[PDB]
Amino acid sequence: LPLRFPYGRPEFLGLSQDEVECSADHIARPILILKETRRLPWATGYAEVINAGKSTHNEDQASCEVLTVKKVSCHYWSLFDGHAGSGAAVVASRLLQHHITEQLQDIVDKIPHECLVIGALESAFKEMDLQIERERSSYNISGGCTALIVICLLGKLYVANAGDSRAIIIRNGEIIPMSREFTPETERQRLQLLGFLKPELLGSEFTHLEFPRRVLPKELGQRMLYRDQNMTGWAYKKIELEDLRFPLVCGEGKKARVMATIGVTRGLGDHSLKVCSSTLPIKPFLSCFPEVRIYDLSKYDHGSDDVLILATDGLWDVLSNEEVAEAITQFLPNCDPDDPHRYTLAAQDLVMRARGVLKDRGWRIDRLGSGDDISVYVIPLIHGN
């Protein structure tokens, strides 16, 4: 089938086709930034690298614009971390904002108003999914992608997250988390519940229960700790045949997985994803619905160095919130607070601090660099006062 949109890098980078090829160098790993002569809304800074060489395309995508919800002005920043291809990421980065605009036009003025714009976003994500499900048949939309977006609507920042990217606010050196990551660990109980009530999704290969280690057949009938979908701690249970299957949810942290395949549990796409060497679908245990978090901009007067950082797992997998905050409060004093390439250079710094430098034959931050794609938005919160 033909692609739905041609693969590329975020539009606002204004790249020629040859420049895109020139950026896909797994060796050089150029850290593409926004041009001096191309300004983004709020003077937002963006920086970007390609993987170390695990996939020939940069499967991260991003886009941002000022949209107009009329029967009006809504700032939009988006970050999509694609996997198993680039179709989802590209499509979502071109059409989600339109799904946002539409779902907003329906509520453009005893339910608080913020609950309608939240509901607008969760409805929007659901219709970006679906559209990817129908057009999957007529277009090549490969893989899936995590989606993290923020809109600005009437002085409130809505950060909607569906994936493992992360958005934090640094306000006077204080880090304010504006998203939470969605993993088998943070979301075990939603999954185990679904395995129990809809057992055919486990299909006699997975148990909805969870055990502290791999359950051997020599322990068949022994007492052993387990965790159930409505449990937080652990209890014993006489191991009983069915518990020899592979555990639906297993691992610890960046080790945790659902059905030994995927480590992130929300996002878009992946309608066809099945377990390795199985006919078992995966998308049931997934959710396109984001968690929206709100930030009222008028409740505080922002300096020049009070930023909103959006990055994909490529950054947060190697650097800590703290580490990021430090490196950003330490970089911005270097640039004239009136300079607008400021934040583009802050982003480029973050990317550099995570990409690393190619040592003997590896990338090193004597800690190791990041080999995932890295995309970083540094949004200045002064432009919202």
Phi, psi torsion values for 88, nearest 5 degrees: -50, -55
**Nearest-angstrom CA–CA distance, 86 and 83:** 7
Q: At its nearest, how many Å lie between Mn ion and the CB of residue 287?
A: 17
Distance of closest approach, residue 74 Cβ to Mn ion, in angstroms: 27
Rounded to 5 degrees, what angle do the CA atoms 270, 276, 280 make? 65
Minimum Å distance from CB 314 to Mn ion?
5
Distances (CA, A) of 211 to 208, 249, 255: 10, 9, 15
CB of 82 to Mn ion, least distance (A): 5
Which position's Cβ is nearest Mn ion? 313
Structure tokens given for 132 = 């990817």
Total interface residues for Mn ion by CB under 5 A? 7
- In Å, what is the CA distance from 291 to each residue of 73, 122, 169, 298? 23, 8, 16, 22
Taking alpha carbons only, the member of 169, 161, 147, 185 closest to residue 321 is: 169
- The conformation of residue 277, written as its DSSP 8-state character, comes to T
CA dihedral 335, 337, 340, 341 (to 10 degrees): 10
Whichever of 243 and 313 has its CB closer to Mn ion, that residue is: 313
Q: Which is nearer to Mn ion, 261 or 329 (CB)?
A: 261
DSSP-based three-state secondary structure for 347? helix
Smallest distance from the beta carbon of 93 to Mn ion, in angstroms? 13
User: Residue 243 or residue 372: which is nearer to Mn ion going by CB?
Assistant: 372
> Rounded to the nearest whole angstrom, what is the least distance from the CB of residue 148 to Mn ion in the complex?
12
- The Cβ of residue 147 has, within 10 Å, a number of other Cβ atoms equal to 30
Q: In the range 54-73, which residues lie near Mn ion by CB under 5 A?
A: 59
Token pair in block for residue 210:
């969870």
Return the range that interacts with Mn ion (CB under 5 A); candidates 62-70, 92-100, 159-167, 223-231: 159-167
Q: Does 270 bind Mn ion (CB under 5 A)?
A: no
Site string for Mn ion, 70-89 (x = CB under 5 A): -----------xxx------
Distance separating the N- and C-terminal Cα atoms of the chain: 48
User: Which of positions 344-373 make contact with Mn ion (CB under 5 A)?
Assistant: 372
Find out whether 203 and 245 touch, Cβ atoms under 8 Å: no
In the list 313, 328, 379, 381, the residue contacting Mn ion (rule: CB under 5 A) is 313
Give the x-and-dash track for 16-55 against Mn ion (CB under 5 A).
----------------------------------------
Measured from the CB of residue 142, what is the shortest distance to Mn ion in angstroms? Answer: 12
When the beta carbons of 32 and 201 are compared against Mn ion, the nearer one is 32
Which residues sit at the interface with Mn ion, rule CB under 5 A? 59, 81-83, 164, 313, 372
